């Protein structure tokens, strides 16, 4: 049931954890009994999950013999950050993590033409990732990725109950009593024994071969039930009862547009490019009104009086347009209007040139012009013409709503030029960007995804017009964001690129191929058996 926990965040986390556990059960053990011998749990406010998920998951790994009784199964072994960090340092997970993340740091070094982002060492005789102190506000080398989560999960899983007991109750009161665990788990007390000989190499191989699955919310329309009180004639008597609404009525599950509403204006003294219009909105006349912004005020006489005043104050809007300055202007409007009388001014209609759409078509709604809301450009169409060139478009939420209401596909399957649609992209999608030499037209065969193949996987982040921005799927946070002062950043000003990060710097949208993964990050592609089942399920 919804709203059964502290807050939506932990509820979503727990629900997705359950879903992922079910998926792994089906994929790796076919849902049979006691397929999970043991489960280890860790969190790393959030403590609300440490006990609820353990209690819920006790139902799978519990033993009915009567030995395992209590609030939680004895097989569930929560840990602590001490064990995970000590194992990571001892077993070399930290070293492989730095080797995995370092190329981002060399890219930052090259982009800033310095050497301060990599530090050489001689105890390891290699370069370690690093950041300058003035870019070290809250930088963390683990946090800037997504697969660290999986790395933590791995280092937790191999940690047995003996390890957590040893590292939580190290106080022995006698060396001999705990010396058995010392000899069994640690090499001689210096370093712990690996779970197996090839642990580090296998962990490297997996970590460099993980694709991250991103949950998507493409809800545009859904069905809504309307119950309303009404007097109904039954058995010759009128009774008040609830009635369900007749006909069809959809509920939009996204904010259709932005709150601010503007009105259309036509100004002879400005040139309007085709496909764009001028919209004017009222705004307070305040200290941020300089010559360029004063020239963006729709009234010409207000512009005349206002520039006269600004000249009178030595061209300083801060002194001119303080509340005291505005009052002085209002009291003495004659000595800036060439001596002509005029009403006071506190708010003015500033105009902007761009693409704003009508909110509706009834009454006076046809005069309200709004802008698309945040996070509502959800579909990005990629088409091809018979010759071979790719065309791009972004369909607004209005056409998505109308198309989905008429039972059609969200994106038109052909553009106005007749170009056939490759496919549509949404935020959190995954695409493969092939090399410049590869010719991916009927590739498929997505079973042999190696490190080079997986490193060329990009996730959509946002779209606008014909532009689509991508981030490598393994990137969570940038090493350094963008600031208008230094004008530097990991992925330039937008913190996301329309091209690859690698040296070729190729348009991602011109060669990318959309892919589909499941909750477990396993690629999904057409196969014979699948083709058979398409219409076996109809057979």
């Amino acid at each position: 049931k919804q709203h059964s926990l502290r807050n939506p965040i932990v509820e979503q986390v727990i629900t997705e954890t359950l879903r992922v556990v079910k998926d792994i059960w089906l994929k790796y053990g076919n849902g049979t009994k006691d397929f999970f011998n043991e489960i280890h749990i860790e969190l790393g406010d959030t403590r609300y999950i440490s006990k609820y998920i353990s209690g819920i998951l006790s139902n799978i790994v519990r033993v009915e013999d009567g030995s395992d009784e209590g609030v939680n199964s004895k097989n569930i072994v929560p840990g602590n950050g001490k064990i995970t960090t000590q194992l990571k340092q001892d077993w070399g997970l930290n070293d492989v993590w730095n080797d995995l993340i370092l190329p981002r740091f060399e890219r930052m070094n090259q982009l800033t033409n310095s050497k301060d982002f990599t530090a050489w060492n001689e105890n390891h005789q290699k370069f370690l990732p690093t950041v300058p102190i003035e870019f070290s506000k809250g930088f963390s080398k683990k946090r800037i990725d997504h697969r660290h989560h999986a790395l933590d999960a791995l280092v937790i899983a191999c940690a047995t109950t003996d390890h957590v007991n040893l590292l939580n109750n190290q106080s022995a009161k006698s060396d001999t009593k705990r010396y058995d665990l010392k000899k069994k788990l640690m090499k001689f007390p210096k370093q712990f024994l690996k779970p197996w000989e090839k642990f580090t190499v296998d962990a490297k191989h997996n970590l460099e071969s993980i694709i991250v699955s991103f949950k998507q919310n493409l809800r545009v329309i859904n069905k809504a039930t309307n119950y309303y009180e009404k007097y109904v004639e039954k058995d010759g008597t009128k009774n008040k009862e609830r009635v369900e609404q007749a006909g069809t009525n959809w509920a939009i599950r996204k904010p259709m547009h932005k709150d601010t509403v503007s009105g259309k204006v036509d100004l002879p003294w400005v040139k309007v490019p085709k496909g764009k219009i001028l919209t004017a909105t009222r705004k307070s006349l305040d200290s941020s009104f300089d010559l360029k912004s004063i020239g963006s005020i729709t009234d010409t006489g207000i512009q005349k009086i206002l520039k006269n005043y600004l000249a009178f104050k030595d061209g300083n809007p801060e002194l001119a347009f303080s509340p005291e300055g505005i009052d002085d202007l209002n009291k003495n409007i004659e000595k800036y209007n060439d001596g002509k009388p005029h009403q006071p001014i506190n708010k003015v209609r500033v105009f902007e040139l761009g693409s704003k759409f009508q909110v509706g078509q009834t009454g006076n709604k046809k005069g309200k012009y709004v802008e698309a809301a945040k996070g509502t450009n959800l579909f990005f169409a990629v088409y091809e013409d018979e010759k071979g060139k790719r065309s791009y478009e972004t369909i607004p939420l209005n056409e998505v709503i109308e198309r989905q209401k008429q039972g059609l596909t969200s994106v038109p399957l052909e553009n106005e030029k007749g170009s056939r649609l490759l496919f549509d992209l949404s935020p959190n999608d995954l695409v493969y960007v092939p090399e410049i030499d590869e010719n991916i037209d009927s590739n498929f065969v997505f079973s042999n995804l190696n490190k080079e193949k997986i490193s060329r996987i990009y996730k959509v982040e946002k779209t606008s017009g014909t532009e689509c921005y991508f981030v490598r799927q393994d990137i969570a946070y940038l090493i350094k964001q963008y600031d208008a002062k230094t004008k530097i950043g990991e992925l330039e000003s937008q913190n996301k690129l329309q091209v690859t990060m690698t040296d070729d710097r190729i348009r991602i949208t011109d060669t990318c191929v959309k892919i589909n993964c499941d909750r477990l990050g396993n690629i999904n592609f057409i196969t014979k058996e699948k083709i058979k089942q398409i219409f076996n399920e109809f057979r």
Partner: protein, 144 residues
């Protein structure tokens, strides 16, 4: 970590409440139209273009009527000429100006309604105005 309306459900609830208040104000207005039309208080120009049969009390589609501006051959005229004249008489007695907005007559009528006879249309306008501006009120009461 600190907590500031961190739920999309709360935002949906806020929009729902705003909408609900809006339609309840509209419903009040509709019922006022129905009652005043029964009482024969609305003027012919206004009342001719509210639906009273299928859409009970709602305006006819693609129409924005004003109770006070009668539209004849594309021109707009004010209907309470005499109360407007009395209000301008009051201002000139106070000696301020002789040129004021027509829609200032409502407050003159509201003062006049306390102790004088006003025509019915003004009274309907006043009731609709009161429906617009209701005022703060605590449901419990509990005088302290």
């Amino acid at each position: 970590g600190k907590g500031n309306s961190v739920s999309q459900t709360a935002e949906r609830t806020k929009y729902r409440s705003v909408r609900r208040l809006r339609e309840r104000f509209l419903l009040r207005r509709e019922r006022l139209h129905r009652v005043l039309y029964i009482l024969n208080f609305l003027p012919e120009h206004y009342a001719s273009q509210i639906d009273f049969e299928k859409r009970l009390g709602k305006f006819k589609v693609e129409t924005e009527p004003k109770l006070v501006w009668k539209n004849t051959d594309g021109q707009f005229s004010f209907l309470f000429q005499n109360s407007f004249n009395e209000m301008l008489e009051d201002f000139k007695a106070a000696g301020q100006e002789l040129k004021i907005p027509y829609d200032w007559t409502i407050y003159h009528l509201r003062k006049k309604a306390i102790s004088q006879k006003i025509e019915k249309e003004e009274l309907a306008w006043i009731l609709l105005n009161f429906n617009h501006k209701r005022g703060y009120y605590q449901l419990r009461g509990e005088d302290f």
